[PDB]
């Protein structure tokens, strides 16, 4: 543990500083150090963990797509073979992405999920597990099937808990359904499942908005709009 000598509170404080400095690799290492202190994470601390790694892996995924697109063209009928360099560098970035995903998955498995009993924590981490198997799935070509089913499994367990324990407007529940929807559309090649899930999720939230405060209304409709954005593209 490179962060083993620093206090948990200081790791959290510096994570918050790193976020303000847009230093997300730092932010991620601080939150990893905080998790490995072994205490459960508060709601704010879980959100710090998620924001940090989403930004890190976001950069790698964007880089990977650029490189994969260049590679595909170089392999099109008519190209002038540039040599191994595009493939090698795509592989480099792909390998670093997979390691980030594996790190996150390691934190969830040792031992965030097993100690998460409240719906808000357990659903959060199970969604994260599905998310990071999904980013693995995006670059997978060889045992893609088991990675995909690992994503599916995590999202499905999260869905089941969210639907029993959370109201339909709960932002965690909405964000999970959003992501599981894109999983269906893009990863599982189940566009009709994706559309069905997104419509039902939106409509069930819509009918529960009346129970919310102004501020909770804002939080839920923000994610409801993401559901609608996708549905517009898909239909």
């Amino acid at each position: 543990g490179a962060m083993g000598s620093m206090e948990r509170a200081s790791l959290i404080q510096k994570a918050k500083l790193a976020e303000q400095a847009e230093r997300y690799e730092d932010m991620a290492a601080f939150m990893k150090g905080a998790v490995e202190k072994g205490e459960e994470l508060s709601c704010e601390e879980r959100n710090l963990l998620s924001v940090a790694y989403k930004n890190v892996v976001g950069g790698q995924r964007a880089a990977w797509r650029v490189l994969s697109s260049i590679e595909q063209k170089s392999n099109e009928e008519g190209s002038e073979e540039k040599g191994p360099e595009v493939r090698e560098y795509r592989e480099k970035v792909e390998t670093e992405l997979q390691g980030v995903c594996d790190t996150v998955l390691g934190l969830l498995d040792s031992h965030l999920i097993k100690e998460a009993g409240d719906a808000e924590s357990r659903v959060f981490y199970l969604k994260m597990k599905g998310d990071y198997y999904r980013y693995l799935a995006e670059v997978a070509t060889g045992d893609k099937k088991r990675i995909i089913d690992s994503a599916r499994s995590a999202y499905q367990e999260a869905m089941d808990i969210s639907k029993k324990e959370m109201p339909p407007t709960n932002p965690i529940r909405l964000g999970l359904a959003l992501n599981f929807s894109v999983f269906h559309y893009e990863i599982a090649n189940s566009p009709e499942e994706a559309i069905s899930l997104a419509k039902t999720t939106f409509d069930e939230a819509m009918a529960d908005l009346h129970t919310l405060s102004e501020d909770s209304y804002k939080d839920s409709t923000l994610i409801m709009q993401l559901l609608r954005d996708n549905l517009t593209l898909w239909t």
Binding site: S50, V51, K54, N55, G58, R65, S69, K127, D131, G175, L176, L178, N179, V182, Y185, E186, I223, L226, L227, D229, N230, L233
Partner: peptide, 10 residues
Amino acid sequence: KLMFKTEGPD
């Protein structure tokens, strides 16, 4: 690639 909406930042 066209990227669909998912939760949180980009």
